[PDB]
Amino acid sequence: VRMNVLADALKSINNAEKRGKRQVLIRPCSKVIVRFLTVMMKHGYIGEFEIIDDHRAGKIVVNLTGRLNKCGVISPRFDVQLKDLEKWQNNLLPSRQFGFIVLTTSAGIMDHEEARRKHTGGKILGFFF
Amino acid sequence: GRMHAPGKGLSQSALPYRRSVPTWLKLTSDDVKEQIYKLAKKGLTPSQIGVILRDSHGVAQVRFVTGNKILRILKSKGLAPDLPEDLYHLIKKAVAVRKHLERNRKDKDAKFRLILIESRIHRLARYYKTKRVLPPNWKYESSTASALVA
Amino acid sequence: GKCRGLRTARKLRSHRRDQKWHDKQYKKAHLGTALKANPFGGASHAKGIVLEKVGVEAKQPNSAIRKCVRVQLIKNGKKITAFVPNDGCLNFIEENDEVLVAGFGRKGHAVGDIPGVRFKVVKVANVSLLALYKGKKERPR
RNA sequence: AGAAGACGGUCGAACUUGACUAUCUAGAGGAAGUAAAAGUCGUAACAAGGUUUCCGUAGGUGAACCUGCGGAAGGAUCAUUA
RNA sequence: GGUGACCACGGGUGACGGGGAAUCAGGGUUCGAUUCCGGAGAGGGAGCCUGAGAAACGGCUACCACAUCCAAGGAAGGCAGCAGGCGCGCAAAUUACCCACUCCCGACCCGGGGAGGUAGUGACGAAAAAUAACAAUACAGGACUCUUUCGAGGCCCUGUAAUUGGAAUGAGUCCACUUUAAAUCCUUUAACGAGGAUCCAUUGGAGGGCAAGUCUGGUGCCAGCAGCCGCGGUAAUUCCAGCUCCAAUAGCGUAUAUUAAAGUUGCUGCAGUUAAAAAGCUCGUAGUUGGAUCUUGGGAGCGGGCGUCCCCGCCCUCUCGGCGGGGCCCGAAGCGUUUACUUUGAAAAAAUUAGAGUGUUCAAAGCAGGCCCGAGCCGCCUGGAUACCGCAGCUAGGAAUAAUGGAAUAGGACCGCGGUUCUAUUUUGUUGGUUUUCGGAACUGAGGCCAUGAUUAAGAGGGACGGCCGGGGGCAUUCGUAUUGCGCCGCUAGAGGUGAAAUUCUUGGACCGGCGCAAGACGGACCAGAGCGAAAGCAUUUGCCAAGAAUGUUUUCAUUAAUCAAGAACGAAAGUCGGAGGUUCGAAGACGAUCAGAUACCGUCGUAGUUCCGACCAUAAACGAUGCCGACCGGCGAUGCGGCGGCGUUAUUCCCAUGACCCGCCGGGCAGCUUCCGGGAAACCAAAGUCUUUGGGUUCCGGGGGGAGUAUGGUUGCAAAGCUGAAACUUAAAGGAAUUGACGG
RNA sequence: GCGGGAGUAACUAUGACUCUCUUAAGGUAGCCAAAUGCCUCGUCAUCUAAUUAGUGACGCGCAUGAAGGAUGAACGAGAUU
RNA sequence: GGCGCCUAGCAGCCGACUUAGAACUGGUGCGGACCAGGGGAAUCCGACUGUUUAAUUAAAACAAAGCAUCGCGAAGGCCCG
Ligand SMILES: [Mg+2]
Ligand SMILES: [Mg+2]
Ligand SMILES: [Mg+2]
Ligand SMILES: [Mg+2]
Ligand SMILES: [Mg+2]
Ligand SMILES: [Mg+2]
Ligand SMILES: [Mg+2]
Ligand SMILES: [Mg+2]
Ligand SMILES: [Mg+2]
Ligand SMILES: [Mg+2]
Ligand SMILES: [Mg+2]
Ligand SMILES: [Mg+2]
Ligand SMILES: [Mg+2]
Ligand SMILES: [Mg+2]
Ligand SMILES: [Mg+2]
Ligand SMILES: [Mg+2]
Ligand SMILES: [Mg+2]
Ligand SMILES: [Mg+2]
Ligand SMILES: [Mg+2]
Ligand SMILES: [Mg+2]
Ligand SMILES: [Mg+2]
Ligand SMILES: [Mg+2]
Ligand SMILES: [Mg+2]
Ligand SMILES: [Mg+2]
Ligand SMILES: [Mg+2]
Ligand SMILES: [Mg+2]
Ligand SMILES: [Mg+2]
Ligand SMILES: [Mg+2]
Ligand SMILES: [Mg+2]
Ligand SMILES: [Mg+2]
Ligand SMILES: [Mg+2]
Ligand SMILES: [Mg+2]
């Protein structure tokens, strides 16, 4: 059964991006997915996304801008401290010039640069570059 | 997929987005409640009550029109069945299969289906004992289950 | 696939230490039966008494009489065969000599065309075979 | 004030005996596995290997093997006509 | 009672534990007998005196094992302290000097200390660093230059060899000083001390990997080399040597343990169709993992510049606010859950690790040191940081993520109002009488109010219901020809079988034809890359019995789920046991052929079996050689089932329904074709894709080939056998996919 | 009821193998100097100081052998060490 | 009957044997007589229990369950006469 809604959504986005589609539909929506997509949209890797609201869990239609390479997930949400965030960063990112790691922190869902900026750790969510 | 079958069917019910009661429904909440009471006294399980109400009296969702579910209404009035409907039907099926099997000893297919049904019974009973619907000491005995159903 | 849950460490480590017995190096180094079967008993070198001088036929593509000595080790009394590794160093070997024997190169495995020989003589009568071969010092008459 | 000594109790070494358990180890005879000799007999497997091969099971034969029953194609057929 | 699959208990350890060490992307893997801390022991045990402290052993007692002296009556032992012996070994130092330093003990400034310091042995290992430098001649070379190769010097850099050829130094001899308890060593410093500067650099190599010779002489598959490929059988790039080169250098080779290489143990991060590999199938407990949903946006001046950036201010309650009665303020009580998480702070031995400062002559080190001294400085300035220290425990901020709960038989929250029992203090100050609703706590009855209180109903699941659908299963029943045998009838000499025959049956009527009878098997054609079932498997008719997927659903419950060690059900064929039955076929067996032989292939016969009922067994190339659940990622035409919508044809009927076709759509299946989605070693695969751009959940399982699925132990079985399952030893390949050739009865 | 004779493997020794004669078929699975083996107190091992005894093993077995062969607990006033 | 709470059960009386534990004690003797299995490792045969030569053989012999074969449908099979 589906146990990682964020993982399913991220895999769907990655496959649609690889196939070159202009829009992608991810069926199970959640607050975590919306926050992840908001982070990606603020960093410009995706376009606008619109939430179709049924009385069940909603759906999301994302406009793909074509500038995404990978948007994978780290399924076991490991506890990430600021002392090992660098090791996570150079394990998951293509380079130190670009690429972001989204981790859920006590201050909210945000990328690793903002996490280090406001000096907090959290649980790993995923990455995109 | 199915719990005990290699089937991946999709046949379901698509509840509409409009939760509002249709304007052509003249039945009020108390009227629907009285209909449910009459059907429950006649002996219908909540699934059958809902089916009759939807087919004949034109009510779409008892929860939408009254604010409460059928089992909640029955339990509030005090005439809900002692066993849950699905558990009762599983025990009924198991009793029927055992009755067939005690005459057809070579029906190994029936023995396999009986094992599947009893596994479902035990899992559902575990769920109900967790939710405290059933007594904490409730146990399904194959010998004494025949007097509980039909 | 493999399990990835946050509290699967017990299963991960149990599976790892179960599967670690299936490679030859770990099994040899941690079972102990190889240590018992090793004539040296986990020692780099050993001492022995030359029981005999023998010649061993080389393998199929080669054709030579490799010069070896049958040696009984002073400790645990095990009998082994040790190659004498130079042109004329068998002449420096006689009966009842106290020879030092080392491994023959690849950790208890036969080397080259010499079948079933895992040791070689380093010193005889507390003088090095290299020294005797180069003539830097003489047999203790 | 009092030593030797004695009855009893308690820790209890040690000896004898028996049991259990670890390794090492002899053994008539039997039965295997490796290696080398162009040793003897055959030619079962590779081609349709000259009875297609192989699996499970059972019986039989100097030896590879053979045969029955069910299976596989990793076949020598991706196909055979209203 | 207590402990156990969250691994108890038992066994092993070549286990003292830790601080730490090796290796070094990250993660890890090994090692810690060893100087610091903690523990234990003093030949093995055991028991004690004394003392604050011992189950002390440089204390005692006894036994055991060793072992000393003896006048044989007795007596005395404990170096895993410092040295030093023997033994064991591959393996490890002097029976030296001193309490001078650091400290310890004592009645104590004074004694003692094999603690400890010093020296000796010491290529364990680490740091520095000699074996030569310069100049001038010849012969070369240079972007050299001077006339345009010709010849030279107004230059530079090597090598060859010399009466060069005179400069600098040590390594050593050795006086003194210094050091030191006394010496030694180092640093100073006299004097000797270098031209094969003979004051002499070695260890391994020169086919490849891997830097270096297709040199020469011997040997001739011998000797030998060779970690691996390999060299050597008379012209050796590989052996034995000479010469010459190569690498490191006062070090280098070898053996062994271990680390990296090894993404060949894979958490990061491996694989499992064909290379080794997914259990025959399903259920299923522990374990692991689990859908969505509860506060978001609005504010003001400081503001990563309302500068529509935003340090950022945010536009819990009640108790004496310590500046019985002030707004001049911030303390006492609780958290409208409990946790995980994250950040901070504390507490975390030193040494070591990283790292700050410091010219030890540089460095490894060490924790030192530096400023002036004009000679009066009748002395000044410092340092002896800091970081890390897992996990567990403590504290304070945050509340995203994840678990967990609150009100459903209201036994709910909050505001009060009745009626209950006690009591710290009352003071209705002379004591005593005390009223104390005094203050709060004791249970209990009737109210008001809360918007009174149940998130939604997953392209999650279970269940109900409707019409179907299907070689799904069991029981009974019906039919079909065929085969074999038998009985009658007809006519005949062959019939059968084969590559050819023969065994065999035949004037006794064999075979053949006809009519019947009996028995037991088997359900052809229809029958398909069609269906159903968890697989194994399932195909004559009809009836009965339960079961089921898919579909339809504006039905119901509301997370009840996925995968699953242990355990359980079923599980082709063969085989086993008991009872029936035994037509055909047919292991074993017999015979005839074939053949060199023929225990076979071919033919004739034929036992067990093949059939049914009941009980075992639990194995197959049990195959898709391919785990399950979930999501995504091309096209196309079909097919099976169900549903939905449409021109028409057809069946009867008078029209629609309902069947049979035709055209589509949807869902679940068996598949097929095609594709530069992508993957893969490729064959190939729309899964074997979405994998170095590596993480959806979870189960099993492989680690070169053999030995070997063997031995042994355990367990199951009537047996056959099934499950679990090594090691010694051996080997450099064994294998997979494709290409070319050769070959094919 | 269930056979003979010859030759044959790179040391010898055996004979997997090959020839023939013959039978109705040539003794298969097993088991053994057995309560069944003459030779015989067979040969080897074990048990003892010493064993024509016992046990284990071997098998061309005068003359073992399958409705009886071979095993196997329990039992036996059975025979033996 | 207004009249009260054994409700963690009390009070009195009566009664067999049996078991367990402790102290003391005797010249270590105590199932004190009587009653009352020596044990173990194997081989052969017979499965076992049973039976047998009264008056020399109790056995390995006979029987046995089990297994297999044969005859017979009554005008019959087997047997007496
Ligand atoms: Mg064959
Ligand atoms: Mg063949
Ligand atoms: Mg130890
Ligand atoms: Mg230690
Ligand atoms: Mg210590
Ligand atoms: Mg002690
Ligand atoms: Mg002591
Ligand atoms: Mg020198
Ligand atoms: Mg050379
Ligand atoms: Mg390594
Ligand atoms: Mg691998
Ligand atoms: Mg394979
Ligand atoms: Mg479970
Ligand atoms: Mg969730
Ligand atoms: Mg014929
Ligand atoms: Mg079967
Ligand atoms: Mg039978
Ligand atoms: Mg036949
Ligand atoms: Mg999984
Ligand atoms: Mg292997
Ligand atoms: Mg025989
Ligand atoms: Mg005999
Ligand atoms: Mg005899
Ligand atoms: Mg005797
Ligand atoms: Mg015997
Ligand atoms: Mg034998
Ligand atoms: Mg008897
Ligand atoms: Mg018997
Ligand atoms: Mg009698
Ligand atoms: Mg008599
Ligand atoms: Mg008698
Ligand atoms: Mg019998």
Swiss-Prot record, chain A:
InterPro entries linked to this entry? Ribosomal_uS8 (IPR000630), Ribosomal_uS8_CS (IPR047863), Ribosomal_uS8_sf (IPR035987)
Where, subcellularly, is it found?
Cytoplasm; Nucleus, Nucleolus
- One of this protein's Pfam families, by short name? Ribosomal_S8
Among the GO molecular function terms of this UniProt record, one is: RNA binding
Instruction: Tell me which residues bear N6-succinyllysine.
Output: K87
- Keyword field: Cytoplasm, Diamond-Blackfan anemia, Nucleus, Ribonucleoprotein, Ribosomal protein
- Tell me a GO cellular component: small-subunit processome
UniProt lists the family membership as follows: Belongs to the universal ribosomal protein uS8 family.
**Which disease is noted in the annotation?**
Diamond-Blackfan anemia 20: A form of Diamond-Blackfan anemia, a congenital non-regenerative hypoplastic anemia that usually presents early in infancy. Diamond-Blackfan anemia is characterized by a moderate to severe macrocytic anemia, erythroblastopenia, and an increased risk of malignancy. 30 to 40% of Diamond-Blackfan anemia patients present with short stature and congenital anomalies, the most frequent being craniofacial (Pierre-Robin syndrome and cleft palate), thumb and urogenital anomalies. DBA20 inheritance is autosomal dominant.
Job of this protein: Component of the small ribosomal subunit. Part of the small subunit (SSU) processome, first precursor of the small eukaryotic ribosomal subunit. During the assembly of the SSU processome in the nucleolus, many ribosome biogenesis factors, an RNA chaperone and ribosomal proteins associate with the nascent pre-rRNA and work in concert to generate RNA folding, modifications, rearrangements and cleavage as well as targeted degradation of pre-ribosomal RNA by the RNA exosome. Required for proper erythropoiesis.
Q: Sorted alphabetically, which NCBIfam families does this protein's record hold?
A: PRK04034.1
Q: What is this protein called?
A: Small ribosomal subunit protein uS8
From Swiss-Prot, chain B:
Q: What does this protein do?
A: Component of the small ribosomal subunit. The ribosome is a large ribonucleoprotein complex responsible for the synthesis of proteins in the cell. Part of the small subunit (SSU) processome, first precursor of the small eukaryotic ribosomal subunit. During the assembly of the SSU processome in the nucleolus, many ribosome biogenesis factors, an RNA chaperone and ribosomal proteins associate with the nascent pre-rRNA and work in concert to generate RNA folding, modifications, rearrangements and cleavage as well as targeted degradation of pre-ribosomal RNA by the RNA exosome.
Q: Which residues carry this modification: N6-succinyllysine?
A: K26, K33
- Give the organism's phylogenetic lineage: Eukaryota, Metazoa, Chordata, Craniata, Vertebrata
Give the originating organism: Homo sapiens
Q: Which family does it belong to?
A: Belongs to the universal ribosomal protein uS15 family.
Q: Where is this cross-link: Glycyl lysine isopeptide (Lys-Gly) (interchain with G-Cter in ubiquitin)?
A: K26
Q: What is its main location?
A: cytoplasm
Q: Which InterPro entries match?
A: Ribosomal_uS15, Ribosomal_uS15_arc_euk, Ribosomal_uS15_N, uS15_NS1_RNA-bd_sf
In terms of SMART domains, this protein maps to: Ribosomal_S13_N, Ribosomal_S15
UniProt keyword list: Acetylation, Cytoplasm, Isopeptide bond, Nucleus, Phosphoprotein, Ribonucleoprotein, Ribosomal protein, Ubl conjugation
Q: Which cysteines are disulphide-bonded?
A: none
The cellular component terms of Gene Ontology attached to this UniProt record, alphabetical and capped at eight, are:
cytoplasm; cytosol; cytosolic ribosome; cytosolic small ribosomal subunit; extracellular exosome; focal adhesion; membrane; nucleolus
Residues that the record marks as modified (Phosphotyrosine) are: Y37
* Post-translational modification as stated in the protein's UniProt record: Ubiquitinated at Lys-26 by RNF14 and RNF25 in response to ribosome collisions (ribosome stalling).
Q: Does the keyword Phosphoprotein apply?
A: yes
Glycyl lysine isopeptide (Lys-Gly) (interchain with G-Cter in SUMO2) cross-link, renumbered residues: K42
NCBIfam families named among the record's database cross-references: PRK08561.1
Q: Subunit notes for this chain?
A: Component of the small ribosomal subunit. Part of the small subunit (SSU) processome, composed of more than 70 proteins and the RNA chaperone small nucleolar RNA (snoRNA) U3.
| Protein name (record) | Small ribosomal subunit protein uS15
One BP annotation, GO: ribosomal small subunit biogenesis
Curated annotation (Swiss-Prot), chain C:
The record describes the protein's role as: Component of the ribosome, a large ribonucleoprotein complex responsible for the synthesis of proteins in the cell. The small ribosomal subunit (SSU) binds messenger RNAs (mRNAs) and translates the encoded message by selecting cognate aminoacyl-transfer RNA (tRNA) molecules. The large subunit (LSU) contains the ribosomal catalytic site termed the peptidyl transferase center (PTC), which catalyzes the formation of peptide bonds, thereby polymerizing the amino acids delivered by tRNAs into a polypeptide chain.
Where in or outside the cell? Cytoplasm, Cytosol; Cytoplasm; Rough endoplasmic reticulum; Nucleus, Nucleolus
**Which residue numbers mark the cross-link Glycyl lysine isopeptide (Lys-Gly) (interchain with G-Cter in SUMO2) in this sequence?**
K36
Keywords, sorted A to Z: Acetylation, Cytoplasm, Deafness, Disease variant, Dwarfism, Endoplasmic reticulum, Hydroxylation, Isopeptide bond, Nucleus, Ribonucleoprotein, Ribosomal protein, Ubl conjugation
A Pfam family that this protein carries is: Ribosom_S12_S23
Question: What lineage is this protein's organism placed in?
Answer: Eukaryota, Metazoa, Chordata, Craniata, Vertebrata
- Which residues does the record list as 3-hydroxyproline (modified residue)? P61
Name assigned to this protein = Small ribosomal subunit protein uS12
Concerning Gene3D superfamilies, the annotation shows: Nucleic acid-binding proteins
Q: Which disease is it linked to?
A: Brachycephaly, trichomegaly, and developmental delay: An autosomal dominant developmental disorder characterized by brachycephaly, ciliary trichomegaly, dysmorphic features of the face and hands, hearing loss, and developmental delay with short stature. Intellectual disability and autism spectrum disorder may be present in some patients.
What domain of life does the native source organism fall in? Eukaryota
| Oligomeric and partner information | Component of the 40S small ribosomal subunit. Part of the small subunit (SSU) processome, composed of more than 70 proteins and the RNA chaperone small nucleolar RNA (snoRNA) U3.
Gene Ontology terms describing biological process: cytoplasmic translation; maintenance of translational fidelity; ribosomal small subunit biogenesis; stress granule assembly; translation
Family to which this protein belongs: Belongs to the universal ribosomal protein uS12 family.
Question: Spans of biased composition, class Basic residues?
Answer: 1-19
Q: Where is this region: Disordered?
A: 1-25
- Gene name, Swiss-Prot/TrEMBL: RPS23
Q: Which residues carry this modification: N6-succinyllysine?
A: K53
Q: Does the keyword Signal apply?
A: no
N6-acetyllysine, modified sites: K134
A GO CC annotation given for this chain: cytoplasm
